[PDB]
């Protein structure tokens, strides 16, 4: 007896493609690698309960290739399989609402992802790929599983792998519209004189070396090619936020002087992030856990500040 069911294949879970599948053959024999809500069903034969359901496939024809690129803005061949593999895990995570924000209950070393997600909800940022637009909208509403699996896929991290918050924000910023952001800097060495520099996009909102936006405005010391120590300071800034980063160090966070921050405790090989947000007081969100304090000191690695337009008074 020949037996078939109708199913739909997709790469973006919006555009559906009608298929008829033989129940005597595996999905892999018929579609190549195949996934059902993240589960790998390549080696599985169709079940009666599968009729009418949507399965993800790899982009193996030109129509799927165009749909996949338009939705995800990547042509990495392993992207979809990495996204599905992550999703099969992230759909089992818990996304509690903590002080009004979507967080993530700790699992699989996902603290870096929770603090990135909490941070995104406090800064003005729009994603360009529709996949990130759609999943971030759901994540804000509390259903963050697709968004978290997408972050992992875009950052080329697997579930359980130790991640860096600054690196993760850099990847997400790459897929965001920061084209309006502009940064002017000035560097003065007493032997080589001055050199001004202009930065755009992601490089205009991120800085590595100091956590303090004020010290960045007043000036910081850096090496020069002559061996002398030059000074770098901020001349002009156009952006809705800025991100200041440094190797973790004991740092004091004062209520009302920043938006949010990341704390990192541990070592290079493994550790733990927490999130600090300045609202009516200072709240520390550690996954599902919440505590408060009026003052905060701890090993901070990233701090986020609000911005609109800033111009220096330094002559
Ligand atoms: C450079 C040729 N690729 C094109 S034209 N479209 N491909 C899009 C795409 C997205 C994710 C994937 O995993 C994948 O295999 C493909
Ligand atoms: Cl968005
Ligand atoms: Zn010099």
mmCIF file of C-alpha atoms and ligand atoms in Angstrom:
data_model
loop_
_atom_site.group_PDB
_atom_site.id
_atom_site.type_symbol
_atom_site.label_atom_id
_atom_site.label_comp_id
_atom_site.label_asym_id
_atom_site.label_seq_id
_atom_site.Cartn_x
_atom_site.Cartn_y
_atom_site.Cartn_z
ATOM 1 C CA UNK A 1 0.000 0.000 0.000
ATOM 2 C CA UNK A 2 1.253 3.489 -0.938
ATOM 3 C CA UNK A 3 0.589 6.054 1.778
ATOM 4 C CA UNK A 4 1.216 9.782 1.737
ATOM 5 C CA UNK A 5 0.438 12.871 3.759
ATOM 6 C CA UNK A 6 0.512 16.557 2.871
ATOM 7 C CA UNK A 7 3.040 18.734 4.756
ATOM 8 C CA UNK A 8 4.544 22.193 4.221
ATOM 9 C CA UNK A 9 8.190 23.036 3.964
ATOM 10 C CA UNK A 10 9.612 26.468 4.805
ATOM 11 C CA UNK A 11 12.773 28.370 5.528
ATOM 12 C CA UNK A 12 11.138 31.413 7.233
ATOM 13 C CA UNK A 13 7.995 29.898 8.806
ATOM 14 C CA UNK A 14 5.873 32.381 6.792
ATOM 15 C CA UNK A 15 6.122 31.273 3.159
ATOM 16 C CA UNK A 16 4.867 27.730 2.964
ATOM 17 C CA UNK A 17 5.577 25.205 0.206
ATOM 18 C CA UNK A 18 3.124 22.315 -0.319
ATOM 19 C CA UNK A 19 4.643 18.845 -0.367
ATOM 20 C CA UNK A 20 3.398 15.276 -0.603
ATOM 21 C CA UNK A 21 5.617 12.823 1.317
ATOM 22 C CA UNK A 22 5.823 9.049 1.141
ATOM 23 C CA UNK A 23 5.272 7.589 4.577
ATOM 24 C CA UNK A 24 7.610 4.691 3.782
ATOM 25 C CA UNK A 25 10.595 7.070 3.457
ATOM 26 C CA UNK A 26 12.368 9.363 5.869
ATOM 27 C CA UNK A 27 12.124 13.131 5.595
ATOM 28 C CA UNK A 28 15.815 13.173 4.780
ATOM 29 C CA UNK A 29 15.384 10.919 1.744
ATOM 30 C CA UNK A 30 12.776 13.361 0.447
ATOM 31 C CA UNK A 31 13.828 16.860 1.566
ATOM 32 C CA UNK A 32 17.367 16.581 2.875
ATOM 33 C CA UNK A 33 17.855 17.824 6.429
ATOM 34 C CA UNK A 34 14.435 18.459 7.950
ATOM 35 C CA UNK A 35 13.280 19.938 11.258
ATOM 36 C CA UNK A 36 9.998 20.141 13.163
ATOM 37 C CA UNK A 37 9.942 23.076 15.583
ATOM 38 C CA UNK A 38 13.672 22.609 15.974
ATOM 39 C CA UNK A 39 13.717 18.828 16.369
ATOM 40 C CA UNK A 40 15.807 17.037 13.755
ATOM 41 C CA UNK A 41 13.417 14.666 11.914
ATOM 42 C CA UNK A 42 15.790 13.863 9.005
ATOM 43 C CA UNK A 43 16.016 10.200 9.977
ATOM 44 C CA UNK A 44 12.321 9.838 10.905
ATOM 45 C CA UNK A 45 9.535 8.633 8.667
ATOM 46 C CA UNK A 46 6.326 10.694 8.387
ATOM 47 C CA UNK A 47 3.696 10.138 11.093
ATOM 48 C CA UNK A 48 -0.036 10.565 10.676
ATOM 49 C CA UNK A 49 0.078 13.464 13.144
ATOM 50 C CA UNK A 50 2.459 15.313 10.818
ATOM 51 C CA UNK A 51 -0.218 15.986 8.205
ATOM 52 C CA UNK A 52 -0.597 19.702 7.576
ATOM 53 C CA UNK A 53 2.412 20.649 9.737
ATOM 54 C CA UNK A 54 5.307 22.902 8.764
ATOM 55 C CA UNK A 55 8.854 21.580 8.528
ATOM 56 C CA UNK A 56 12.013 23.634 8.122
ATOM 57 C CA UNK A 57 14.383 22.581 5.339
ATOM 58 C CA UNK A 58 17.671 23.850 4.005
ATOM 59 C CA UNK A 59 17.583 26.222 0.999
ATOM 60 C CA UNK A 60 18.115 23.662 -1.760
ATOM 61 C CA UNK A 61 16.465 25.589 -4.633
ATOM 62 C CA UNK A 62 16.585 29.177 -5.790
ATOM 63 C CA UNK A 63 13.192 30.112 -4.321
ATOM 64 C CA UNK A 64 14.170 28.973 -0.844
ATOM 65 C CA UNK A 65 17.570 30.629 -1.168
ATOM 66 C CA UNK A 66 15.965 34.020 -1.874
ATOM 67 C CA UNK A 67 13.403 33.555 0.926
ATOM 68 C CA UNK A 68 16.147 32.561 3.406
ATOM 69 C CA UNK A 69 18.414 35.435 2.560
ATOM 70 C CA UNK A 70 15.606 38.002 2.646
ATOM 71 C CA UNK A 71 14.489 36.756 6.084
ATOM 72 C CA UNK A 72 17.884 36.195 7.751
ATOM 73 C CA UNK A 73 20.418 38.326 5.810
ATOM 74 C CA UNK A 74 22.942 35.471 5.776
ATOM 75 C CA UNK A 75 24.072 32.873 3.233
ATOM 76 C CA UNK A 76 26.114 30.764 5.673
ATOM 77 C CA UNK A 77 25.216 27.190 4.641
ATOM 78 C CA UNK A 78 25.070 25.931 8.240
ATOM 79 C CA UNK A 79 22.912 28.792 9.563
ATOM 80 C CA UNK A 80 19.525 27.118 9.515
ATOM 81 C CA UNK A 81 20.762 23.924 11.077
ATOM 82 C CA UNK A 82 22.483 25.915 13.866
ATOM 83 C CA UNK A 83 19.316 27.932 14.442
ATOM 84 C CA UNK A 84 17.161 24.809 14.646
ATOM 85 C CA UNK A 85 19.666 23.040 16.949
ATOM 86 C CA UNK A 86 19.629 26.026 19.311
ATOM 87 C CA UNK A 87 15.847 26.363 19.172
ATOM 88 C CA UNK A 88 15.295 22.806 20.206
ATOM 89 C CA UNK A 89 16.917 23.870 23.488
ATOM 90 C CA UNK A 90 15.787 27.450 23.882
ATOM 91 C CA UNK A 91 12.128 26.504 23.468
ATOM 92 C CA UNK A 92 12.567 24.614 26.793
ATOM 93 C CA UNK A 93 14.029 27.602 28.645
ATOM 94 C CA UNK A 94 11.932 29.787 30.988
ATOM 95 C CA UNK A 95 11.519 33.531 30.268
ATOM 96 C CA UNK A 96 10.237 35.174 33.447
ATOM 97 C CA UNK A 97 9.202 38.811 33.496
ATOM 98 C CA UNK A 98 11.585 40.458 36.016
ATOM 99 C CA UNK A 99 10.898 44.082 36.950
ATOM 100 C CA UNK A 100 8.957 44.450 33.742
ATOM 101 C CA UNK A 101 11.551 42.989 31.372
ATOM 102 C CA UNK A 102 11.832 39.629 29.684
ATOM 103 C CA UNK A 103 14.653 37.688 31.341
ATOM 104 C CA UNK A 104 15.869 34.080 31.039
ATOM 105 C CA UNK A 105 16.002 31.504 33.845
ATOM 106 C CA UNK A 106 19.536 30.254 34.159
ATOM 107 C CA UNK A 107 20.370 27.190 32.018
ATOM 108 C CA UNK A 108 23.176 26.033 29.714
ATOM 109 C CA UNK A 109 25.492 28.957 30.552
ATOM 110 C CA UNK A 110 22.973 31.426 29.147
ATOM 111 C CA UNK A 111 23.692 34.239 31.579
ATOM 112 C CA UNK A 112 25.385 36.277 28.812
ATOM 113 C CA UNK A 113 22.281 35.955 26.735
ATOM 114 C CA UNK A 114 19.999 37.051 29.562
ATOM 115 C CA UNK A 115 22.024 40.182 30.209
ATOM 116 C CA UNK A 116 22.135 40.974 26.461
ATOM 117 C CA UNK A 117 18.371 40.530 26.212
ATOM 118 C CA UNK A 118 17.725 42.664 29.266
ATOM 119 C CA UNK A 119 20.007 45.350 27.792
ATOM 120 C CA UNK A 120 18.289 45.415 24.409
ATOM 121 C CA UNK A 121 15.006 46.210 26.129
ATOM 122 C CA UNK A 122 16.529 49.356 27.607
ATOM 123 C CA UNK A 123 18.206 50.892 24.531
ATOM 124 C CA UNK A 124 16.788 52.267 21.300
ATOM 125 C CA UNK A 125 17.689 49.804 18.568
ATOM 126 C CA UNK A 126 15.988 48.448 15.439
ATOM 127 C CA UNK A 127 17.085 45.255 13.690
ATOM 128 C CA UNK A 128 17.325 44.949 9.967
ATOM 129 C CA UNK A 129 16.715 41.244 9.216
ATOM 130 C CA UNK A 130 13.028 40.395 9.412
ATOM 131 C CA UNK A 131 13.923 37.304 11.381
ATOM 132 C CA UNK A 132 15.368 39.448 14.210
ATOM 133 C CA UNK A 133 12.533 42.023 13.926
ATOM 134 C CA UNK A 134 9.883 39.343 14.320
ATOM 135 C CA UNK A 135 11.616 37.311 17.043
ATOM 136 C CA UNK A 136 12.559 40.427 19.087
ATOM 137 C CA UNK A 137 8.953 41.562 19.041
ATOM 138 C CA UNK A 138 7.950 38.166 20.458
ATOM 139 C CA UNK A 139 10.774 38.269 22.966
ATOM 140 C CA UNK A 140 9.597 41.612 24.306
ATOM 141 C CA UNK A 141 6.164 40.056 24.788
ATOM 142 C CA UNK A 142 7.758 37.190 26.736
ATOM 143 C CA UNK A 143 8.232 34.452 24.083
ATOM 144 C CA UNK A 144 11.976 34.825 23.578
ATOM 145 C CA UNK A 145 12.866 31.270 22.432
ATOM 146 C CA UNK A 146 13.247 32.100 18.726
ATOM 147 C CA UNK A 147 15.145 35.315 19.470
ATOM 148 C CA UNK A 148 17.597 33.532 21.756
ATOM 149 C CA UNK A 149 18.145 30.731 19.172
ATOM 150 C CA UNK A 150 18.773 33.384 16.520
ATOM 151 C CA UNK A 151 21.329 35.179 18.677
ATOM 152 C CA UNK A 152 23.168 31.917 19.097
ATOM 153 C CA UNK A 153 23.076 31.199 15.357
ATOM 154 C CA UNK A 154 24.207 34.692 14.323
ATOM 155 C CA UNK A 155 27.019 34.648 16.953
ATOM 156 C CA UNK A 156 28.083 31.106 15.977
ATOM 157 C CA UNK A 157 27.671 29.899 19.557
ATOM 158 C CA UNK A 158 26.033 26.617 20.553
ATOM 159 C CA UNK A 159 23.827 26.151 23.579
ATOM 160 C CA UNK A 160 26.044 25.665 26.608
ATOM 161 C CA UNK A 161 29.049 27.500 25.195
ATOM 162 C CA UNK A 162 30.511 30.330 27.264
ATOM 163 C CA UNK A 163 29.769 33.647 25.671
ATOM 164 C CA UNK A 164 30.989 37.300 25.955
ATOM 165 C CA UNK A 165 28.414 40.067 26.261
ATOM 166 C CA UNK A 166 30.432 42.687 24.363
ATOM 167 C CA UNK A 167 31.042 40.290 21.465
ATOM 168 C CA UNK A 168 27.355 39.330 21.375
ATOM 169 C CA UNK A 169 26.236 42.975 21.277
ATOM 170 C CA UNK A 170 28.710 43.614 18.454
ATOM 171 C CA UNK A 171 27.058 40.878 16.369
ATOM 172 C CA UNK A 172 23.574 42.173 17.102
ATOM 173 C CA UNK A 173 24.632 45.751 16.367
ATOM 174 C CA UNK A 174 25.989 44.557 13.013
ATOM 175 C CA UNK A 175 22.420 43.560 12.089
ATOM 176 C CA UNK A 176 20.866 46.798 13.394
ATOM 177 C CA UNK A 177 20.323 50.163 11.741
ATOM 178 C CA UNK A 178 23.009 52.328 13.313
ATOM 179 C CA UNK A 179 23.767 54.244 10.127
ATOM 180 C CA UNK A 180 22.840 57.571 11.803
ATOM 181 C CA UNK A 181 25.429 57.090 14.586
ATOM 182 C CA UNK A 182 28.592 59.188 14.468
ATOM 183 C CA UNK A 183 31.589 59.614 16.761
ATOM 184 C CA UNK A 184 34.436 62.139 16.540
ATOM 185 C CA UNK A 185 37.584 61.564 18.602
ATOM 186 C CA UNK A 186 40.838 63.468 19.072
ATOM 187 C CA UNK A 187 44.210 61.964 20.016
ATOM 188 C CA UNK A 188 47.061 64.237 21.133
ATOM 189 C CA UNK A 189 50.656 63.099 21.663
ATOM 190 C CA UNK A 190 53.092 65.773 22.757
ATOM 191 C CA UNK A 191 55.742 64.592 20.258
ATOM 192 C CA UNK A 192 53.508 63.766 17.249
ATOM 193 C CA UNK A 193 50.843 66.431 17.810
ATOM 194 C CA UNK A 194 47.155 65.762 17.129
ATOM 195 C CA UNK A 195 45.067 63.438 14.987
ATOM 196 C CA UNK A 196 41.267 63.477 14.820
ATOM 197 C CA UNK A 197 39.224 60.449 13.798
ATOM 198 C CA UNK A 198 35.587 59.883 12.832
ATOM 199 C CA UNK A 199 33.750 56.587 13.467
ATOM 200 C CA UNK A 200 30.373 55.463 12.109
ATOM 201 C CA UNK A 201 27.807 52.802 12.815
ATOM 202 C CA UNK A 202 28.751 50.088 15.268
ATOM 203 C CA UNK A 203 32.180 51.571 15.896
ATOM 204 C CA UNK A 204 30.588 54.911 16.823
ATOM 205 C CA UNK A 205 28.618 53.406 19.764
ATOM 206 C CA UNK A 206 31.141 50.895 21.210
ATOM 207 C CA UNK A 207 34.390 51.666 23.026
ATOM 208 C CA UNK A 208 36.869 49.305 24.690
ATOM 209 C CA UNK A 209 39.163 50.550 27.394
ATOM 210 C CA UNK A 210 37.120 52.453 29.956
ATOM 211 C CA UNK A 211 33.730 51.987 31.614
ATOM 212 C CA UNK A 212 33.131 55.666 32.353
ATOM 213 C CA UNK A 213 31.443 57.898 29.774
ATOM 214 C CA UNK A 214 32.604 60.944 31.697
ATOM 215 C CA UNK A 215 36.260 59.932 31.658
ATOM 216 C CA UNK A 216 35.915 59.289 27.914
ATOM 217 C CA UNK A 217 34.815 62.922 27.592
ATOM 218 C CA UNK A 218 37.617 64.229 29.814
ATOM 219 C CA UNK A 219 40.271 61.984 28.251
ATOM 220 C CA UNK A 220 42.029 58.618 28.553
ATOM 221 C CA UNK A 221 45.662 57.594 28.078
ATOM 222 C CA UNK A 222 46.795 55.323 25.237
ATOM 223 C CA UNK A 223 50.119 54.340 23.669
ATOM 224 C CA UNK A 224 51.578 56.028 20.595
ATOM 225 C CA UNK A 225 53.949 54.717 17.932
ATOM 226 C CA UNK A 226 56.822 56.856 19.286
ATOM 227 C CA UNK A 227 56.618 55.255 22.758
ATOM 228 C CA UNK A 228 54.989 58.293 24.399
ATOM 229 C CA UNK A 229 51.542 58.136 25.964
ATOM 230 C CA UNK A 230 48.883 59.997 23.963
ATOM 231 C CA UNK A 231 45.470 61.139 25.222
ATOM 232 C CA UNK A 232 42.139 60.285 23.553
ATOM 233 C CA UNK A 233 38.932 62.200 24.264
ATOM 234 C CA UNK A 234 35.444 62.453 22.778
ATOM 235 C CA UNK A 235 34.795 65.413 20.508
ATOM 236 C CA UNK A 236 31.267 64.767 19.194
ATOM 237 C CA UNK A 237 28.660 62.018 19.554
ATOM 238 C CA UNK A 238 25.384 61.357 17.736
ATOM 239 C CA UNK A 239 23.619 58.169 18.883
ATOM 240 C CA UNK A 240 20.699 57.093 21.090
ATOM 241 C CA UNK A 241 23.056 55.215 23.437
ATOM 242 C CA UNK A 242 26.671 54.382 23.957
ATOM 243 C CA UNK A 243 28.337 51.230 25.238
ATOM 244 C CA UNK A 244 31.548 51.460 27.277
ATOM 245 C CA UNK A 245 33.489 48.248 27.910
ATOM 246 C CA UNK A 246 36.659 47.190 29.701
ATOM 247 C CA UNK A 247 38.246 44.086 31.163
ATOM 248 C CA UNK A 248 36.337 43.267 34.357
ATOM 249 C CA UNK A 249 37.359 45.380 37.308
ATOM 250 C CA UNK A 250 35.901 46.568 40.612
ATOM 251 C CA UNK A 251 33.708 49.517 39.679
ATOM 252 C CA UNK A 252 31.127 51.677 41.465
ATOM 253 C CA UNK A 253 27.712 52.139 39.816
ATOM 254 C CA UNK A 254 25.788 55.218 41.006
ATOM 255 C CA UNK A 255 22.004 55.412 40.694
ATOM 256 C CA UNK A 256 20.881 57.744 37.934
ATOM 257 C CA UNK A 257 24.242 58.020 36.125
ATOM 258 C CA UNK A 258 23.856 55.145 33.630
ATOM 259 C CA UNK A 259 21.176 53.015 32.025
ATOM 260 C CA UNK A 260 22.334 49.449 32.674
ATOM 261 C CA UNK A 261 25.527 47.435 33.016
ATOM 262 C CA UNK A 262 26.951 43.925 32.923
ATOM 263 C CA UNK A 263 28.789 42.398 35.904
ATOM 264 C CA UNK A 264 31.155 39.473 35.338
ATOM 265 C CA UNK A 265 32.520 37.272 38.139
ATOM 266 C CA UNK A 266 35.033 34.544 37.404
ATOM 267 C CA UNK A 267 37.866 33.901 34.928
ATOM 268 C CA UNK A 268 38.478 33.744 31.186
ATOM 269 C CA UNK A 269 37.718 30.023 30.955
ATOM 270 C CA UNK A 270 34.350 30.227 32.763
ATOM 271 C CA UNK A 271 32.326 32.659 34.822
ATOM 272 C CA UNK A 272 28.982 34.296 35.427
ATOM 273 C CA UNK A 273 27.289 37.482 34.236
ATOM 274 C CA UNK A 274 24.643 39.514 36.057
ATOM 275 C CA UNK A 275 22.710 42.565 34.912
ATOM 276 C CA UNK A 276 22.397 45.877 36.791
ATOM 277 C CA UNK A 277 19.708 48.360 35.822
ATOM 278 C CA UNK A 278 19.244 51.875 37.240
ATOM 279 C CA UNK A 279 15.545 52.667 37.685
ATOM 280 C CA UNK A 280 13.930 54.088 40.834
ATOM 281 C CA UNK A 281 16.831 52.272 42.557
ATOM 282 C CA UNK A 282 19.531 49.847 41.446
ATOM 283 C CA UNK A 283 18.186 46.413 40.545
ATOM 284 C CA UNK A 284 20.375 43.376 39.899
ATOM 285 C CA UNK A 285 18.733 40.824 37.595
ATOM 286 C CA UNK A 286 20.460 37.456 37.628
ATOM 287 C CA UNK A 287 18.291 35.395 35.333
ATOM 288 C CA UNK A 288 15.090 34.803 37.286
ATOM 289 C CA UNK A 289 16.638 36.295 40.494
ATOM 290 C CA UNK A 290 16.140 39.926 41.525
ATOM 291 C CA UNK A 291 17.738 41.987 44.308
ATOM 292 C CA UNK A 292 18.048 45.721 44.903
ATOM 293 C CA UNK A 293 20.449 48.171 46.501
ATOM 294 C CA UNK A 294 20.934 51.933 46.756
ATOM 295 C CA UNK A 295 24.696 51.644 46.006
ATOM 296 C CA UNK A 296 26.606 49.094 43.903
ATOM 297 C CA UNK A 297 30.249 48.030 43.610
ATOM 298 C CA UNK A 298 31.367 44.986 41.661
ATOM 299 C CA UNK A 299 33.348 43.690 38.669
ATOM 300 C CA UNK A 300 31.748 45.557 35.783
ATOM 301 C CA UNK A 301 32.621 44.834 32.130
ATOM 302 C CA UNK A 302 30.069 46.874 30.138
ATOM 303 C CA UNK A 303 28.057 49.996 30.957
ATOM 304 C CA UNK A 304 25.336 51.531 28.790
ATOM 305 C CA UNK A 305 24.418 55.220 28.743
ATOM 306 C CA UNK A 306 21.696 57.252 27.096
ATOM 307 C CA UNK A 307 22.641 59.799 24.455
ATOM 308 C CA UNK A 308 21.142 62.068 21.822
ATOM 309 C CA UNK A 309 23.776 64.621 20.771
ATOM 310 C CA UNK A 310 26.962 65.618 22.588
ATOM 311 C CA UNK A 311 29.640 68.175 21.680
ATOM 312 C CA UNK A 312 32.786 68.800 23.687
ATOM 313 C CA UNK A 313 33.843 72.115 25.179
ATOM 314 C CA UNK A 314 37.581 71.144 25.055
ATOM 315 C CA UNK A 315 39.396 73.536 22.673
HETATM 316 C C1 LIG B 1 25.240 32.709 -1.633
HETATM 317 C C2 LIG B 1 24.082 31.801 -2.092
HETATM 318 N N1 LIG B 1 23.036 31.650 -1.098
HETATM 319 C C3 LIG B 1 21.732 32.232 -1.360
HETATM 320 S S1 LIG B 1 21.506 33.029 -2.706
HETATM 321 N N2 LIG B 1 20.626 32.177 -0.432
HETATM 322 N N3 LIG B 1 20.783 31.490 0.755
HETATM 323 C C4 LIG B 1 20.321 31.848 1.818
HETATM 324 C C5 LIG B 1 20.648 30.921 2.972
HETATM 325 C C6 LIG B 1 20.450 31.260 4.278
HETATM 326 C C7 LIG B 1 20.787 30.314 5.251
HETATM 327 C C8 LIG B 1 21.314 29.064 4.942
HETATM 328 O O1 LIG B 1 21.599 28.092 5.938
HETATM 329 C C9 LIG B 1 21.494 28.745 3.615
HETATM 330 O O2 LIG B 1 22.013 27.501 3.242
HETATM 331 C C10 LIG B 1 21.171 29.672 2.642
HETATM 332 CL CL1 LIG B 2 13.451 45.480 15.602
HETATM 333 ZN ZN1 LIG B 3 53.723 60.054 19.747
#
